[PDB]
Amino acid sequence: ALTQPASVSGSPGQSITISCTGTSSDVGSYNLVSWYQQHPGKAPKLMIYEVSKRPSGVSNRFSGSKSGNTASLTISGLQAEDEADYYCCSYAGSSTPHVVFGGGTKLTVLGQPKAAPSVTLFPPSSEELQANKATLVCLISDFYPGAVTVAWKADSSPVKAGVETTTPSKQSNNKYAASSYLSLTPEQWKSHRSYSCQVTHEGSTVEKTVAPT
Amino acid sequence: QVQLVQSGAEVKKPGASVKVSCKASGYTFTGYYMHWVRQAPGQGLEWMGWINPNSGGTNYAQKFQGWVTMTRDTSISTAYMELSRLRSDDTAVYYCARGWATYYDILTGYSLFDYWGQGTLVTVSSASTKGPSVFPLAPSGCLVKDYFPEPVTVSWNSGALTSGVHTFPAVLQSSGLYSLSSVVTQTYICNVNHKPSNTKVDKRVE
């Protein structure tokens, strides 16, 4: 591979540069470096080709350079739509011609206001209970940034077994959302007085509670 | 214009083989190199090889050598990729992406992967195709549970209820089955469609 920075941040209306360090057998040898921008759920989109050259319908904001063994992509005038994964690619092969890619770079467009999460807890359904099963569902849906920690409590005391949590993800609102599940047995569900879902977000917790009675 | 269309998502048990297709249109197939690139869910991009559709000449990335076979049929302008002896960690979206021209003296430019296909998600697991169990989240939503493979589609009131519905990403449990929940913010009915298993379920939400 070529070594790319894992993550890059900047403020709106400014420029940033994403490195793409290669060897003398790729970026050093050839002027065939390309850059691709990938949005969630979508195939990658050619932004830059031949180090500097730009395809038809790509904005001027996207500039391409290369010095020695490292490539760089500069995005002038940062817009919110620029938030995506940025891969760098190059031609390789002294006597064995191949293509190599970059590890990738998530660009974060700063400015989005910090939002405290919104927790909703559902109890097991009676119709799920009739299947000799019980599941509690924790939904966190309106928070920025997209870093949360969930922790489950049964009668005030921690439980960690049968927890299946999703990693947070953006919504239409452009605020992050996560879900949490606690898979129980009907015996456990009935035998406890309370069950809790404690969600910690940047040094602060929102706990919801549900009771079988 | 130029559009690459790939075959449908395939679900296979480890050790089996798969054949993916990539229909070209709006360009001369024999004119341009046809590359393949795979991306594991939430992971980066991996080049696998190119085919010269004109000559038929092939080039595999080192770790793709010995199990990846690429062919083309210029008659229907479709490129083929055959993956053999599939492993669990070979779960990825498989993309065909158009290279540059195939002749020696190059006009235009070296615009690599100017156009991509829509992808083919090849899922491999020891798990069997499982139809989901849907349970209503009564108010004070629907929990779609224990399904394989991923996708799953949740409609509300025969698809009439469009406002306030939120569908959450799926979790991959230790069972190797997926589970997601969708929440609704007169009569409300649940209609979940699991295309890969051809399953539909009706449920009421009282």
Numbering used by the authors:
A (entry chain L): 3 to 215
B (entry chain H): 1 to 140, 152 to 196, 205 to 225
Task: Please quote the authors directly.
In the present study, we evaluate the activity of nine anti-SARS-CoV-2 monoclonal antibodies (mAbs), previously isolated from convalescent donors infected with the Wuhan-Hu-1 strain, against the SARS-CoV-2 variants of concern (VOC) Alpha, Beta, Gamma, Delta and Omicron. To understand the basis of neutralization and escape at the atomic level, we used cryo electron microscopy (cryoEM) and X-ray crystallography to determine structures of the two mAbs: TAU-2303 and TAU-2212. To summarize, our study provides functional and atomic-level structural data on the interactions between naturally elicited antibodies and SARS-CoV-2 variants. Both TAU-2303 and TAU-2212 are potently neutralizing but arise through different B cell developmental programs.
TAU-2212 is one of the most potent mAbs in our panel, and while not being able to bind soluble RBD by ELISA, it inhibits ACE2 binding as measured by flow cytometry, suggesting that receptor binding is blocked through a different mechanism to that employed by TAU-2303. To investigate the neutralization mechanism of TAU-2212, we prepared Fab2212 by cleaving mAb TAU-2212 with papain. The purified Fab2212 was crystallized and the crystal was diffracted to 2.7 Å. Data analysis revealed that the crystal belongs to the space group P65 with cell dimensions a = 75.98 Å, b = 75.98 Å, and c = 348.14 Å, and with two molecules in the asymmetric unit. The structure was determined by molecular replacement and was refined to a final R/Rfree of 0.202/0.246. The final model of Fab2212 contains 419 residues, while residues 141–151 and 197–204 of the heavy chain are not visible in the map. No significant differences were observed between the two molecules in the asymmetric unit (a calculated R.M.S.D. of 0.77 Å between the aligned Calpha atoms). Fab2212 is not able to form a stable complex with the prefusion stabilized SARS-CoV-2 spike ectodomain, but interacts with spike trimer on the cell surface. Since the resolution of the maps of conformations 1–3 and 5, is too low for ab initio model building, atom models of the complexes were built by fitting the crystal structure of Fab2212 and the cryoEM structure of the S trimer into cryoEM maps.
